[PDB]
Symmetry: C3
Subunit: 231 residues, 3 copies
């Protein structure tokens, strides 16, 4: 395990996701409100899935070698397995907060699936120049998602409770900033142009992942917006 | 890319799915009705997914070699990845049109999953005679789906709005004819008996795919059946 | 096929799932009640999926070799493909019976996904001692599911119809006993410590699978709890 310099960040990531999972699990024990239960379920599952995939990367299972540029390049494929399930759960948290219509939710989840799926294909593609074609398609799917979060959701939040409108606005802003960093790190890291070494890349993704999951969850689950308006 | 004679049909397929995706995306921009949004979301996602998988076939990612009959046989596995997601979306379009009950929808999607999954296993099976066992099981799942579309849905459409009944009937008929061709092409093509060469097989699937997705979508999204009855 | 001593149990399993599938399919033909249709759909799909995966194991497709302990160890990976889809369907049968809230259903299905997914990783892991780390995480996800079935569902059933409360209690008890045997068989069988040989392991899983699917389904589909209260 320690044979890879990036192991320290995989281990820290595993620990922080594990701790985040346990914290949300305990916190949600005292919850009976049916609406709050939905948000706790979604939000606890996110770091639990990430915990398993960080562990698989730490132990070496979630790593494969991909030939491109005349080299055997270490590619952590387990990231995409994580993201396939956790990024639509994160979007679902946002969509339920603002009572999004079903068509909009399906558009978001579908675009998200395309985003992660094409990122996976790009990560595993052996023809170097083609990796960036997949990156571009994935990034276009991301831009669609960000567009919807701003010009379909923000003006939906404003007709809702003030506490859900303010909580949505904060989580929207956190999401757009954090999620936009992922394609940049991929592009300059070992999957793309290879300018930033894998150990630093792994650190960067770990900070983004913990912030986008445990950070996000801490903000959401401390808000009164997750509860039905009750006396 | 041009090293494979079937590349021209993969390229045309990619282009037509891409163009179809953009057309539906633009067309649905001016839509606020919650019901119509569902149909636009579902129907736009279908060629978008197909676009990505056609591209993966064009670039060579979605192709593998399978030993059977003492030969290395080129198998485009990306078709099944496409179909796994797009065929239940197509069925969902039909089921929502007639306000199908939840049990019926689950039966359809489940049978569809079995249909595509067993087709994939058959496509990748190395014992030649066993490929046709999987083809038979998949075809039985197809026949179940077609049965339900006729003797569970058609008489559901007739108690609904005339515009939804007439639109459903047309899309049902398009679906049954087009979908029934797929097992025949598989059986006589490079996956099955090998009587029709891969380049012609690829052409045939491209015509079926564009018709079943973009053709289907053009009929559906031009109907007033996708809108709630409103003043 | 007969080259593997466990083939007889794979063949019997295939037959019993096939027969169970046909029986439930015929039985549900005379059903119009929308609630009952849901239970028939879910419950018929379960042995149908299991039939396909038992067949893939019989024909040899669903088997791979995994190096650990200095040996090539036969691992039937198709079990996890089965279980990935059938165990959440089984939980859905239980959850719908007691009209579980959406948050609880998502927690169950999510924990179940983690349970099966980590079992799959453990089954395919090449470092022997690490296989048991994945077994432990999977078992913890199982224990969560069993906890919810007892201390979240049982007291939900009691405020419902007596026929649904009594049917739920029986199916809950069947589920907890049968499902708890699976991690034990894995641990002592060819995936784990290797004390029980593969042919006996295969027998054990076949008895558990038929009981947990066809047995379970026979109890559920003969109950009046699956019908809406109607005059
Ligand atoms: C009911 O609605 C609220 C339940 O949501 C909360 C439900 C949770 C989503 C349940 C899912 C967590 C499972 C219990 C997962 C089990 C293994 C976990 C990964 C635990 C890992 C952390 C520990 C090992 C440090
Ligand atoms: C509604 C939304 C969910 C829409 C989803 C959007 C989605 C369509 C976007 C594209 C997804 C698609 C790229 C998934 C591809 C998975 C694939 C990378 C798995 C690895 O297999 C690739 C090659 C080795 O590189 O296998 C070597 C050759 C092997 C023989 C491969 C044969 C097995 C195939 C992988 C079977 C395909 C199954 C499905 C792709 C399962 C989807 C997995 C998940 C990653 C989407
Ligand atoms: C809101 O409900 C309506 C939105 O549906 C319409 C929503 C669409 C389903 C959004 C999904 C499309 C994504 C934007 C996919 C991005 C890449 C596409 C494959 C674009 C490819 C076509 C172009 C490259 C020729
Ligand atoms: C409700 C509905 C959805 C019901 C669904 C119906 C469904 C049950 C029908 C059968 C689906 C099942 C056949 C999927 C099999 C996928 C498999 C072909 C992927 C390729 O792996 C096959 C061999 C190489 O040929 O791998 C070589 C050996 C490797 C070590 C394989 C180990 C990895 C396994 C593939 C893990 C299994 C994961 C699940 C099958 C994911 C499902 C993928 C999708 C195609 C259904
Ligand atoms: C409508 O709601 C009730 C339908 O549920 C019942 C619907 C069923 C879930 C339909 C799914 C079964 C498909 C017809 C599967 C076809 C192949 C089967 C595996 C048949 C195998 C058994 C036989 C070959 C012995
Ligand atoms: C809401 C709930 C559903 C939550 C779900 C919980 C879930 C997160 C729990 C963990 C699931 C995760 C372990 C699935 C891993 C599948 C993996 C074993 C498939 C086989 O690939 C493993 C190695 C060979 O051993 O591939 C060799 C290297 C290859 C290059 C691998 C590259 C292809 C990757 C497999 C692509 C990943 C796609 C997704 C994992 C699809 C999920 C399949 C299913 C088994 C969950
Ligand atoms: C918890 C993990 C999260 C929130 C991950 C988010 C990841 C993305 C938004 C990834 C986006 C990518 C692209 C837009 C193109 C390049 C490849 C990706 C997959 C890194
Ligand atoms: C957009 C793509 C569509 C509508 C594809 C439909 C495909 C089928 C109905 C495929 C059916 C098959 C069988 C019935 C058995 C042989 C294998 C298949 C998968 C080709
Ligand atoms: C129809 C099949 C059923 C009901 C299978 C149930 C399987 C399980 C509950 C498996 C549990 C496992 C663990 C808890 C850890 C070890 C690995 C598994 C996957 C066997
Ligand atoms: C969105 C953030 C992307 C920028 C990442 C900056 C990383 C700077 C680290 C120094 C680069 C290491 C190069 C020498 C090894
Ligand atoms: C459902 C349509 C299946 C029939 C396809 C007919 C294809 C005819 C093309 C000629 C066959 C090529 C054989 C000589 C290369
Ligand atoms: C939950 C049941 C697990 C116990 C399984 C008992 C199997 C006993 C069979 C005898 C073991 C075979 C060892 C000699 C080959
Ligand atoms: C490819 C995996 C996509 C599914 C991820 C799980 C999250 C799905 C959330 C469903 C949202 C509800 C839509 C109506
Ligand atoms: C194996 C992939 C199956 C899922 C495909 C996505 C479409 C699912 C549509 C869900 C229909 C709603 C059922 C209640
Ligand atoms: C990884 C596969 C998980 C999906 C299995 C299919 C069963 C899903 C049942 C959905 C229950 C409804 C939740 C709201
Ligand atoms: C186009 C929608 C406006 C809100 C999205 C902001 C786009 C940020 C760009 C992210 C950088 C990705 C490379
Ligand atoms: C049995 C249901 C009647 C409607 C379905 C028509 C079946 C068409 C056969 C398709 C050919 C597949 C090989
Ligand atoms: C902790 C919840 C109480 C009900 C679950 C009973 C646990 C049975 C243990 C199963 C054995 C697995 C190794
Ligand atoms: C070796 C790099 C070749 C450049 C490929 C860039 C493709 C980016 C596509 C953006 C439309
Ligand atoms: C393919 C990228 C699309 C980003 C711009 C959004 C187009 C308008 C969509 C309106 C729902
Ligand atoms: C080499 C071909 C052997 C014939 C197999 C046909 C099987 C079809 C099954 C239909 C019930
Ligand atoms: C070779 C076996 C080494 C023992 C591993 C047991 C790990 C079990 C983890 C339970 C917390
Ligand atoms: C509760 C702490 C969980 C941390 C387990 C994984 C950390 C890796 C240590 C090497
Ligand atoms: C908008 C046109 C999209 C076409 C891109 C793929 C066509 C392949 C050209 C070689
Ligand atoms: C209807 C009987 C189904 C049995 C088919 C599979 C049994 C395997 C026989 C070798
Ligand atoms: C993006 C950083 C999130 C910070 C989380 C802090 C949570 C405290 C309530
Ligand atoms: C099956 C062929 C479909 C033809 C689509 C034409 C759409 C015009 C409205
Ligand atoms: C766990 C054993 C189940 C027994 C099923 C018998 C069904 C008869 C109604
Ligand atoms: C990591 C366990 C958290 C302890 C409880 C925190 C207050 C709910
Ligand atoms: C008003 C919300 C500001 C949140 C910005 C957080 C940036 C990481
Ligand atoms: C809305 C601001 C987006 C900031 C992008 C930051 C990418 C590192
Ligand atoms: C391909 C872009 C379509 C242009 C608009 C067509 C009329 C909505
Ligand atoms: C009355 C509907 C006829 C549609 C037939 C289309 C055949 C491709
Ligand atoms: C309902 C008519 C079906 C026609 C099947 C055509 C197969 C090529
Ligand atoms: C296996 C076929 C079952 C025959 C009908 C049983 C009574 C519904
Ligand atoms: C009162 C229900 C008892 C069911 C026990 C079944 C054990 C297999
Ligand atoms: C509730 C009793 C569980 C029995 C476990 C049996 C495991 C073989």
């Amino acid at each position: 395990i320690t044979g890879r310099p990036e192991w320290i960040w995989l281990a820290l990531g595993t620990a922080l996701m594990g701790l985040g999972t346990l914290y949300f699990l305990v916190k949600g024990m005292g919850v009976s409100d049916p609406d709050a239960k939905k948000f706790y379920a979604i939000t606890t599952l996110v770091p639990a899935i990430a915990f398993t995939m960080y562990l698989s990367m730490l132990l070496g299972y979630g790593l494969t070698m991909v030939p491109f540029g005349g080299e055997q390049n270490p590619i952590y494929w387990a990231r995409y397995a994580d993201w396939l399930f956790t990024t639509p759960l994160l979007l679902l948290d946002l969509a339920l907060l603002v009572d999004a219509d079903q068509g909009t939710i399906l558009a978001l989840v579908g675009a998200d699936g395309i985003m992660i799926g094409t990122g996976l294909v790009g990560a595993l593609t052996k023809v170097y120049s083609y990796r960036f074609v997949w990156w571009a398609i994935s990034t276009a799917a991301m831009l669609y998602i960000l567009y919807v979060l701003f010009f379909g959701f923000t003006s939906k939040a404003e007709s809702m409770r003030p506490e859900v409108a303010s909580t949505f606005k904060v989580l929207r802003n956190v999401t757009v900033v954090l999620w936009s960093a992922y394609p940049v790190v991929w592009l300059i890291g070992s999957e793309g142009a290879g300018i930033v070494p894998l150990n630093i890349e792994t650190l960067l993704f770990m900070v983004l992942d913990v912030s986008a999951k445990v950070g996000f969850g801490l903000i959401l689950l401390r808000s009164r917006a997750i509860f039905g308006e009750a006396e």
